[PDB]
Specification:
elongated, about 45% helix, Antimicrobial peptides, antimicrobial protein
């Protein structure tokens, strides 16, 4: 049930760009 992690990940969205820089 990935829908459980993706739903909560909404709060950690800011992290989707914080680390994304390490490779971007």
């Amino acid at each position: 049930g990935i829908g459980k992690a993706l739903k909560k990940a909404k709060k950690g969205i800011g992290a989707v760009l914080k680390v994304l820089t390490t490779g971007l």
